[PDB]
């Protein structure tokens, strides 16, 4: 269907990059976001979409899509994880839903007691 | 769904936008990429147009209709260029750069490339 | 403190997920409420102190079913797809946590 | 201010731990030989600990069917449902995994204070 992939930054102050390209002779994409459902047109071949880790504020870019999370994720404490996810409605085919994931790591900040002690 | 006029303003002033930023960003960087790669950014930024449209309208729409009155070309004109001014392209820029993925410089992008920002195809969702 | 938590995702949609927890927490601190978000709902659960597990299903009686999300596609693989839930839990002091629970399931056929 | 009346809590808590250890015991007489006491004890308190931990949505299905009812419930109501959940769940999804991954959990002493607790005596959390 169409060649995608997510690039991932190493700093949340950077959004991550989404690129896709149809190769072929996708009526409409929604993504999922923390901030909306975010309209997405798939041109013939290259395209490209920004993803945002921080929090919705008011003067971000219009159309931005901001990450759902961050998720606590099994086997490392040490990091999270940010998750949209996406569904392409074809010409008369059955529908895509991607999952659009990024890892970031999280603060290596020192414990402290619990308050109630 | 919006008069020709209107989506014109819209769509050159967010070309010529994209196209300032990406000067700028090239007087930086822009002495290692060939020409066809620099060409390849412009359609980049025409592409981007194409791809948020539907999204960008959204964001007209409410604008437009908070204005409170029967808007006029120049209200286009003006959120057209907010739009223009506000995307950070620079993190695409970086990235393709950077990574060596500035897409391969295809005929359908030259001929993007040739067409007047006014006459961009957009799609209305 | 946290919980210390791990999920068994089988290779085979007949075998449910396993999520197995363990809270190792002064008496003081507790999980006031915890919720799974299922494809099929909402799912309430109560994590006690110590040992904790549940079922998570890959298809849809029985109470407190809870059926993951998906199947999803992932990028540049075409033989897996993923399979998730959502957890939150709220705790007697301090923010929420917020549990991703992900199974990638051997794609029908490659 | 109570959630439930106690006697509906007990019928339930006694035919839900009642299934789940008949579950059990069918189990280990298969399994069995190979398990230590402690480990034996350590899936007698799974049983029990699976159900306060899923107690609130139990309560759920519950309330559905006892609302289908159309009257005023009555003990042997909650007595039947309770031994629906006790029947339905098959717990050996649990039993098999711990037994093949070595995650018996350790024997520890809050779990025999558990064990040794009547089942109609076992707290549960209806939020
Ligand atoms: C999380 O753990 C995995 C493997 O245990 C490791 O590869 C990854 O770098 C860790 N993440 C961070 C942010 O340290
Ligand atoms: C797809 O993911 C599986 C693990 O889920 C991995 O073994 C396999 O190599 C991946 N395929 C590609 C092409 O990366
Ligand atoms: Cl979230």
Known sequence: ?117 | FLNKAFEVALKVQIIAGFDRGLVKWLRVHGRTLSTVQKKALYFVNRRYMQTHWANYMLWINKKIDALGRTPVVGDYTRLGAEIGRRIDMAYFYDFLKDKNMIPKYLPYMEEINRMRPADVPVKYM
Not at chain 1, 15 to 34: G, H, N, T, Y
């Open chain 1, 1 to 117: 269907g169409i060649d995608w992939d997510v690039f991932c930054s190493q700093n949340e102050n950077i959004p991550a990059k989404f690129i896709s390209r149809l190769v072929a002779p996708v009526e409409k994409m929604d993504v999922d976001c923390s901030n909306g459902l975010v309209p997405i047109t798939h041109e013939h071949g290259f395209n490209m979409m920004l993803i945002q880790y921080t929090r919705n504020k008011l003067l971000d870019s219009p159309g931005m899509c901001v990450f759902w999370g961050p998720y606590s994720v099994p086997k490392n404490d040490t990091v999270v994880l940010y998750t949209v996810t996406a569904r392409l409605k074809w010409s008369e085919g059955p529908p895509t839903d991607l999952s659009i994931q990024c890892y970031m790591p999280k603060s290596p900040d020192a414990p402290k007691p619990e308050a109630c002690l």
